[PDB]
């Protein structure tokens, strides 16, 4: 798999058809479209199953390059859950002027900048997925 691909929706639908054809209830690969909470559980279960196939680097925050007062940033605009598929933020604005306290907080708290401005790391003391030092 290429490093940049992160959608992975039709693959889930095709696996669902290949292995569970005659299951008699709808299945939304992206739980954003679910109805009530019971459909959320029903679809998150299959997502838990299928997400053990795809590469592990393609999970976590989705970042993108935004500008404020002529300065390029790197902030996150969504996620890619192992259970709830892909989620996109609704209120995102490129080209800003100034940031007030609220936005300063939500930008300083993201791991996007911290990880994008750090050295790669390969920790062999563990087996969990490392990210950056």
């Amino acid at each position: 798999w290429d490093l940049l691909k992160y959608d992975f929706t039709e693959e889930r639908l095709k696996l669902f058809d290949r292995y569970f054809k005659y299951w008699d209830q709808t299945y939304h690969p992206n739980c954003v479209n679910c109805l009530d909470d019971r459909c959320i559980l029903h679809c998150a279960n299959f997502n838990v199953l299928f997400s053990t196939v795809f590469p592990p680097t393609s999970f976590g925050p989705l970042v993108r390059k935004i500008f404020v007062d002529g300065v390029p940033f790197v902030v996150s605009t969504g996620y890619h859950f192992r259970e709830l598929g892909v989620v996109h933020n609704q209120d995102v604005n490129l080209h800003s002027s100034r940031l007030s306290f609220k936005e300063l907080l939500v930008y300083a708290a993201d791991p996007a900048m911290h990880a994008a401005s750090g050295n790669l790391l390969l920790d062999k003391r563990t087996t969990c997925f490392s990210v950056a030092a």
Partner: peptide, 11 residues
Amino acid sequence: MQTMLFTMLRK
């Protein structure tokens, strides 16, 4: 906060 953000970005 803002100075930290700027200095981190400039790298």
